[PDB]
């Protein structure tokens, strides 16, 4: 308790000796409380003119409008201690998992210079406000330096002094703790930890556009229904038991990294110093030593890591490798070491995990009521009762995976596309919104134009987002970048041809592809079926789709006129009804 939080709690009561008070109508349970003090202050979504004039029709659809307009009391709940037989199960799995994920890398720190990089190319790495204005002017200033120096040398002493947490649920930090963060936690992102090639059953850096083969490769696996549950607030039900099976990623690592990283996870994840905003306008002091609230770059990696063993443990309790969570007898903890050992590598290749995210393809259905270890994990499943058995999927093309569905759509020309889709009242009423202040027309013009061009690239097949994609590249001036505040693989952020980017995506680079005649024109990718795209939101066949369409190049001359007079494209003719 105190002796690790109390340094962290002291500076912060001498900075606002002036209002400090145990407050007696605090209302925390499952946080320990430690004071309040004086504060007063809150960013709403703003609409994107660019986008909301190119998409008159979806202005009476309230799918789409109400997502521009406008829970706490799921972080102030615990979460019971698991048995001893889950606990064992956790230990042994997570020990096996840092190994096969450790066998071909090599954990190391990353450094002043990588750090300043990623600051000086716009990456949310979740900071706050104060002495220097934004991230740019801090990373530049050696007295920043000597800040995190000062705070670098109290970890390897065992200390923490400024590693404290702003609550928003989106956890900021002050750049220095994000930066010690990220030099002993960041190679797990930066060197692809849970690659594909690496972990077997994660998708990091994969792309929207691989996502649906994956799919359909575990598709392809003899066993089961696909499994695709989700869990009801994930970064609250991860147990003080789930974050030192994290932590065991320090046995892998060696001197002055072993003990920076150790410090991490000692000082700042499982113990931790919260300040939230609270109307009653004070700041409370709040810690805890369970929970999820680390950057979420390093919260994807640990997420994915403890979802793979959760998993691998169901599947386990599935297959009848262990019969009670109550105790692991001695020969049970052989036969679950043992079946790691021979088929952990398989049983990983039968899942896709991104972060809380999962599909599993079990050897069989007995997955389906295979509960207790989950359940007793705290990994309880959404929007489902307790110990009623998972519906699981029979077509990969029905699972639901990272927002979407896939799709098998065959080419004209017989090669087949595996594409991502979801509502397209979901697609479009996104594109609408923009975040912050300060938006010039030529900025929001260029993000309007990040999201006509992820459309061209990854839902060509609806024909509503193509000729909409197609109508926003034509309003905003051919020469303008591509732009986005908050930054999967982007390839639609460039100038570089649509055609071009398309073809090295869906052909070239492609390896389920084996054919790669490259395509010559827009005219030769093909659309979903009419009803498949009505069934996924189109609203093809509708009177105010029709005359949207028809008059298209008076809604461009619109948004042309706007923005004045600037160098412009025509990109409608690339679709065949515009072709003469
Ligand atoms: C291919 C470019 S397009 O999407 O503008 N034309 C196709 C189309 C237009 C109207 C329809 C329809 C299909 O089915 C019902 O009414
Ligand atoms: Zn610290
Ligand atoms: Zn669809």
Redesign the pocket.
């Known amino acids: 308790n105190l002796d690790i939080i109390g340094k962290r709690i002291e500076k912060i009561k001498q900075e606002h000796e002036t209002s400090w008070h145990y407050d007696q109508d605090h209302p925390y349970k499952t946080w320990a409380y430690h004071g309040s003090y004086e504060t007063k202050q809150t960013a709403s979504s703003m609409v994107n003119g660019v986008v909301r004039l190119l998409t008159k029709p979806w202005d009476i659809i309230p799918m789409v409008t109400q997502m521009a307009m406008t829970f706490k009391e799921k972080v102030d709940t615990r979460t019971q201690e698991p048995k001893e037989g889950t606990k064992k199960l956790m230990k042994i799995t997570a020990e096996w998992l840092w190994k096969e994920l450790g066998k071909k890398k090599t954990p190391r720190m990353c450094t002043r210079e990588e750090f300043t990089r990623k600051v000086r190319s716009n990456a949310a790495l979740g900071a706050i406000f104060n002495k220097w204005k934004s991230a740019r002017e801090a990373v530049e200033d050696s007295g920043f330096w000597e800040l995190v120096d000062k705070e670098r040398n109290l970890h390897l002493e065992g200390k923490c002094e400024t590693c404290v947490y702003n609550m928003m649920a989106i956890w900021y930090m002050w750049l220095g703790a994000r930066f010690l963060e990220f030099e002993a936690l960041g190679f797990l992102n930066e060197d692809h930890w849970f690659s594909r090639e690496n972990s077997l059953s994660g998708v990091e850096g994969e792309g929207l556009h691989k996502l649906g083969y994956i799919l359909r490769d575990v598709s392809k696996k003899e066993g089961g229904a696909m499994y695709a549950d989700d869990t009801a607030g994930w970064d609250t039900r991860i147990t003080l038991e789930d974050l030192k099976n994290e932590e065991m990623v320090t046995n892998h690592m060696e001197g002055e990294h072993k003990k920076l990283a150790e410090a991490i996870f000692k000082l700042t994840y499982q113990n931790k110093v919260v300040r939230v905003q609270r109307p009653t306008t004070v700041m409370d002091i709040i810690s805890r030593r369970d929970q999820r609230g680390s950057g979420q770059v390093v919260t994807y990696g640990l997420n994915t890591f403890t979802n793979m063993e959760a998993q691998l443990i169901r599947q386990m309790e599935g297959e009848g490798v262990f019969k009670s969570i109550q105790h692991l007898t001695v020969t049970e903890e052989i036969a679950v070491k043992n079946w790691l050992v021979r088929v952990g590598r398989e049983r990983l290749s039968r899942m896709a995990i991104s972060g809380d995210d999962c599909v599993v393809k079990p050897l069989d259905d007995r997955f389906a009521s295979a509960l207790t270890a989950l359940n007793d994990m705290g990994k309880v499943r959404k929007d489902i009762q307790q110990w009623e058995p998972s519906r699981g999927w029979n077509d990969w093309t029905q699972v639901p995976f990272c927002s979407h569905h896939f799709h098998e759509l065959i080419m004209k020309d017989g090669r087949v596309l595996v594409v991502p889709c979801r509502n397209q009242d979901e697609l479009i009423g996104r594109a609408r919104i923009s975040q912050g202040a300060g938006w010039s027309l030529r900025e929001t013009a260029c993000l309007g134009k990040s999201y006509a061009q992820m459309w061209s690239l990854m839902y060509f097949h609806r ?2 987002l ?2 909409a994609a197609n109508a926003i590249c034509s309003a905003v001036p051919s020469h303008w970048v591509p732009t986005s505040r908050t930054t999967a693989t982007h390839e639609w952020m460039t100038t570089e041809d649509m055609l071009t980017v398309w073809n090295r995506v869906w052909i070239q680079e492609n390896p389920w592809m084996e054919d790669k005649t490259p395509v010559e024109s827009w005219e030769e990718i093909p ?1 979903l079926g ?1 009803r498949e ?2 069934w996924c939101g189109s609203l ?2 509708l009177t105010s ?2 005359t949207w ?1 028809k008059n298209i190049q008076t809604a461009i001359n619109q948004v042309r006129s706007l923005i004045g007079n600037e160098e412009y494209t025509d990109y409608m003719p690339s ?3 515009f072709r003469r």
């Open positions: 024909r509503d193509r000729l659309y009419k795209d009505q093809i066949g789709r029709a369409a679709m065949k009804r």
